Symmetry: D2
Subunit: 430 residues, 4 copies
């Protein structure tokens, strides 16, 4: 008496399949995992509950996990990030998915709850982006924890929460931090946002970037990519930071580094990337230039005080889905994107498929590691080995026609490293 | 006769919200309204417009009307109309004949609807690409004596005007708007720098980083497209016939080679030349699997789309304006907008701010031709530099630019008029 | 009379090694030698040159001589001479009067030495900044009728030629070399993009990353300087009087404001305007400690160096062309080259490759004026676009650029001559 | 009967002092160390032998160590990197320094040997860049090892050797890896080379960068900076790499990644950044374009086969010091800079003072840590704590007029971090 899936429109499946066929050819890491492991089925017996943006890319990940032998049930980790044609293709393929663009917060939780129970038992693996599924199980279903072999976690906010859980003695399942694979953090967070931030802003507003002042809160991997994207189209970018190291990086790249208390008077476009609460507040909104565009690209919608806008504006005019224009008591207007939810996925299509192939190849490796070698992973938060990290990058070089050099025997002896790697020490920062 | 013909008048309220937002990004046009709405310099003008029917064009149209013109409009491309913008214009009572996805015969019918007003035939042309200009000269020459002027928006259109003039076949005075400084060095460059990538992304969602992109032509459009692609981490290869443009591209760090070589390397191909026969069957046969091919020049003459349709073994429509072909060699090609201009066909064209430069020039050109026709004999003319400077000045406040004024001592030193113009006529910026 | 006057003839062997290396970077000039050494089109010419006596200029001088001219030379700046290059020229038998660190009176004496040859007075001028042109017009008007032509290298010099012509005081025909496309859009832009930073680094070794740099003017030179500084991670602020140039800088992501505001923020100041009174005492008094201040425009008129000398409480020479001043407010200012052009005064000026563009134009202008004087009435003229294109084409092979040729079908489509020129006269590149 | 110092010309001291006064005002980290520690003299009793490029910046470091109470004797770690006016200023100040530009290899070793013995005993601290002093003591003076409290090591090559020494049981003294402080590797190696590579090439050759093809071997921190510098002036940059992760970074930044076997046919400028032997060989030289400029920026001159040029060229023409033009049997010419030694220091002035203040503030902190808290540092290779790394960056923000944001109590509680840091986990890569 349980729903088999729930999507906006399963009739979108044929279109979704065409988009998936195109994405497969952009995702050689995932396709290589299928080539290597479809016969031996390393994930046989796995029952993976996934909570991760239900996009075309995630659809390719899902079909890879199934090809490797897993049973899978899926929900999205944001109410606006699902791509309904991708969700339809997965549903039509017979995979239980509960995801649509424009869920309410109640429907969102309900969707996660649909992923916990399989035909042959409760979930035994977690694949999470942001930690909502991990937190749901630990807080509300602790009786299921003993039956879960592992968690792999995708994003900075989610891994931050895992480390907090472990330090507070709350974590009861081994986890792999996928965010901090080199081939994830230094690629997805940086080059992904470099493309998908502007895509979200443009699809929402069609605003010209050239000539504008853009304020980017945070200069971590996401903020570095956002800043570079904006500068590239001719915006003057101002950075805010709490970390003196990241601040010094930004200054050395030619950006003005100042506080939001100052920058709010200058910005035409505001992008929050911090993963922290209370970044853009009423006192900032009241000082902004007319028709300032405000958005967030951090995981949770905690950075922008949207409640202040709802409570203090004279009127909110909906322009189109996920674009609202508020008229303030000072007579100026604020354009808010996706109600403060992650803008690249909420207003566009998130990262393009090629860079997601890096992140998702790491996810498949982590699921295989946790499922097939649980003795290597006690309760705690672990990284994938560098040799596997390198292997992810290597799997994407051929698509780009990169010709990698091989060390000679003499060179490898000189450097004291193996010809096949790893090539860097554990502390290397790339 | 029809009051208009659009896709869906029901889109008018959404279109109006988009127009409201665009007005606040178009200070040049709004300034023209502020200055001229009372005096109505375009009273008596009956302007037929043939120009991409977008949100930005809607703001231009309502500016012409505020200035006292009667206007009838069509789009200059079968895929460039934004149906919400067309609906807002139609709802406002302006005769517009335009929708996204016209057949070629519908396209001609739409232009033909703009020719006749209540009081008589058109007496002004506002053209982008020269189709309206050419239609009247070739099919309706009896209307020429009743037309006071033409203003022309784009490089391909002005190229045709100069050709017509040199052949002695141009019969109405024209202003070349494309070659205002504030048009060519802004719209063609910075506009394409944003809107090319928009078109490619909305169509395909492809990652640009890591790709090889081949841009044919390194004029104003090619310069903008190349910079955009490089900015997201594509390796950009340029083709050129002009040794000066070629050397510019080489000095900016781009490999410059022929399409005959570059077709073997590109993952993305963008044609910017305004020239026929740029990407041919012999190129398609050598391309990397799933190469994305598109055109941003005015006419769909650069890519041999006929070759793909005839020679591919499979052709699948992915979604509107995106086709994926399988060739006999087993590889795939993705073709955007059937080779029509990709930024307008697959996205929303240039953003409003830069279009305010171009369209402020257009309003000035219409005012010049309508109110000072004796200044403009039959031939092709530029706006004066003082007006060109005024267009730029009108956009500075929005960006909070603080312009320096010369002192009288400095202006005497330079031998320069203190309010401009500040550059000689040959200045290239 | 002296055969020459240079700092140290002993530097000639080193100078010759530098000339050898530069020849291999200057294919345009070498091509002029290949084409014209046998026919000697400059036979009979007696060319007085006033132009920075650098390695690059030495290659130009030996090209003029290969083409049959007699030449006598001086530098157009007291700090720009490269003494090894001057020595190589002198050792080769060419009368050159130039050394690094001339007094202003020595500078004038050097120009005066270039006026008289064995067979008579000069009959051609090759000028950079207009000092030789102005000297003859004001102090030696009796020599004017014997001078066939002037070719002029730099923006400040051509500005003066146009001023002279409009006042009716120019008496010899002139070619504006600065505004060849292959000069203005390459030398002024890409040359300064490399040589500004060179001058600042050799003088001060300051880190650029993290600094605020203020560039006054956003013409060809300012565009190059700004890009250079931004490339190393300086935050660049632009000042401008021209709303078009100002809007270009804003659209490229630079803050545009006045010097009155920017003087409070800059760590590095670069003047590029060609205008008097850009950085004044009221600016110096507001500058951050150890602000570096320099000028790259032709004349030392942009920075009020007199103010520093009179108002500083301490002044210490760090090394040649680098002075550090302590002001009454307790802060320090570092001034480069006493406000003379910093790239040539503190480094080696533009690299040879881009100077081959400029100097190929110079040789073409000298040939045009000397051999076709009836084409050039008194007034200021440009080289034809075909020659401009030829300059660019001559540098493509060195960079391994592969230029596309139009097919006959494409040239017919475009209405274009198949070998060029490919652009109309108003094209801005 | 030992020399008190040996420099090219002590008469250069007045000029050197002027350059030092200017550098001090660019080095707020070092000046802050003087302000904080000149009174308490934490390095009293220290006898530091330094082997590190004797530049204006190093002179400011030296005077800082002396101000903090140390006795110091110094040599350079490269035969061409000394700046004679800086060496003169140090000599005139009464500090034993043995360094000049253009040492022979025999003089180079002799100079290191002069630094071992002080009035009151042998050295008891090592400050090294490249490991030559560390290696000299371990190999030739093992009887001095017991009297040495610590080593701080500056550069990638030197730290690579320390880790090799420790893994082979050869290291007998605790060492701090300064290279891999965040405020060193991510700033010095990257932004320093971004400026000083082009400076070396230009002072040597005055060549135009725009329009050229430049080949950069290696895409680590140095190669990333070199590549960016060359691209910025309009060179087309081709990268070589053995590490698939770095190769993928380069491709994603828009660079062609291919082998030197292919790239040698295309390059007009070659820059080696690998720290590895056998990068540019005879077979590459014979295929290069006429007047190709070849240089190295890695620590040791092991990357370019200069011996091949000396043995196979028809003639070597010296252009000026550290610039040689070889005429090959194929009729083409090769311009070799600094005989293959590090080009930024050999042909120009190395990194500018501001970024060296980051590296050298870390060096002072490491010397204080090893000298005053030896119990925290057993034999092995250690990093400085993140709080000190952050403090280095923070000390440079004021000079740049950076306004750093402070977390509110509520934000710090939300993030679970202290308001004063550290702000990042140990694995953070910046
Ligand atoms: N939307 C996407 O596709 C996408 C992609 C990757 C990561 N993420 C999310 O983006 C967010 C940032 O990720 P990241 O990897 O860049 O993390 P990060 O830790 O590397 O960067 C965040 C930066 O924010 C700074 N910061 C924290 N509080 C601040 C404040 N109050 N003011 C100014 N700066 C402050 C920190 O000092 C840090 O440098 C996370 O929530 C992550 O989960 C989103
Ligand atoms: N889609 C848009 O929003 C948009 C905007 C502005 C202009 N345009 C159109 O874009 C096109 C280009 O305009 P532009 O202003 O850049 O013109 P342009 O004349 O400045 O540049 C075109 C370049 O193409 C080069 N070229 C010509 N034939 C070639 C060939 N066979 N191979 C390689 N290069 C060749 C020319 O040498 C020239 O430099 C025109 O059709 C124009 O109307 C479109
Ligand atoms: N050092 C060199 O190697 C070198 C090379 C080329 C040109 N030059 C010289 O550089 C100078 C600039 O040449 P250009 O080709 O860039 O000329 P330009 O006319 O293109 O640019 C100068 C700019 O300065 C702006 N300007 C004028 N007065 C100003 C003021 N008071 N404040 C702010 N901006 C002001 C103008 O609007 C103009 O855009 C000239 O003196 C020229 O001869 C030097
Ligand atoms: N001259 C300077 O001022 C300066 C500054 C900092 C570091 N260094 C020196 O520069 C060198 C590089 O330092 P780094 O910090 O960039 O080290 P790194 O380890 O970060 O980078 C070196 C790169 O070289 C690559 N590599 C190794 N062998 C190769 C080969 N055969 N072909 C192509 N690539 C290869 C590696 O994969 C690595 O990514 C070291 O010797 C270091 O001591 C010099
Ligand atoms: N297209 C996408 N599909 C699925 N997930 C996506 C996508 N774009 C960004 N992300 C996520 C957002 C997360 O914060 C980050 O880990 C990144 O991988
Ligand atoms: N948004 C737009 N509206 C209306 N016209 C647009 C738009 N974007 C580009 N163009 C045109 C295409 C033309 O070729 C060019 O002149 C440019 O102004
Ligand atoms: N190296 C140089 N030799 C000779 N002249 C040079 C050099 N660099 C810049 N210039 C001049 C300075 C002039 O203003 C500009 O025309 C430029 O060509
Ligand atoms: N100016 C300099 N002084 C002293 N040392 C310098 C300098 N430039 C680079 N280095 C070194 C070269 C080393 O490889 C690197 O650690 C860097 O810090
Ligand atoms: Na996608
Ligand atoms: Na728009
Ligand atoms: Na030179
Ligand atoms: Na220095």
């Amino acid at each position: 008496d349980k729903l088999p899936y729930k999507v906006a429109d399963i009739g979108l499946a044929a279109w979704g399949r065409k988009a998936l066929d195109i994405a497969e050819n952009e995702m050689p890491g995932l396709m290589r995992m299928r080539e290597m492991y479809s016969a031996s089925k390393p994930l046989k017996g796995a029952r993976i509950a996934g909570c991760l943006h239900m996009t075309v890319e995630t659809a390719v990940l899902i079909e890879t996990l199934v090809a490797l032998g897993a049973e899978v049930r899926w929900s999205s980790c944001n109410i606006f990030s699902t791509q309904d044609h991708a969700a339809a293709a997965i549903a039509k393929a017979g995979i239980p998915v509960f995801a649509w663009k424009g869920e309410t917060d109640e429907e969102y939780l309900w969707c996660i709850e649909q992923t916990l129970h399989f035909k042959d038992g409760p979930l035994n693996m977690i694949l999470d982006d942001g930690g909502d599924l991990t937190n749901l199980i630990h807080t509300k279903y602790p009786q299921l924890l003993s039956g879960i072999r592992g968690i792999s976690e995708e994003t900075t906010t989610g891994v931050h929460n895992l480390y907090k859980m472990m330090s507070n003695g709350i974590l009861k399942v081994p986890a792999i931090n996928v965010n901090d694979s080199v081939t994830k953090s230094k690629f997805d967070n940086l080059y992904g946002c470099r493309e998908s931030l502007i895509d979200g802003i443009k699809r929402a507003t069609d605003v010209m970037i050239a000539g504008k002042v853009a304020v980017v809160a945070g200069y971590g991997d996401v903020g570095k990519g956002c800043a570079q994207a904006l500068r590239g189209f001719g915006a003057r970018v101002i950075i805010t930071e709490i970390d003196p190291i990241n601040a010094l990086q930004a200054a050395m790249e030619g950006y003005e580094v100042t506080t939001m208390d100052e920058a709010c008077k200058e910005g035409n476009i505001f992008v929050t990337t911090t993963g922290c609460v209370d970044i853009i507040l009423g006192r900032h909104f009241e000082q902004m230039k007319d028709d300032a565009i405000v958005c967030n690209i951090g995981h949770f919608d905690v950075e922008i005080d949207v409640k202040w806008l709802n409570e203090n504006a004279v009127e909110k005019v909906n322009i189109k889905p996920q674009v609202d224009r508020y008229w303030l008591k000072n007579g100026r207007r604020i354009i808010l994107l996706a109600e403060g939810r992650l803008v690249n996925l909420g207003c566009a299509m998130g990262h393009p498929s090629f860079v997601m192939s890096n992140s998702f190849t790491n996810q498949v490796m982590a699921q295989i590691e946790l499922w097939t070698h649980p003795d290597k992973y006690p309760v705690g938060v672990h990284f994938l080995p560098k040799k596997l990290d390198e292997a992810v990058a290597e799997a994407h070089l051929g698509k780009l026609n990169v010709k990698l050099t091989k060390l000679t025997e003499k060179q490898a002896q000189y450097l004291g490293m193996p010809i096949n790697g790893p090539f860097k020490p554990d502390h290397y920062r790339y």
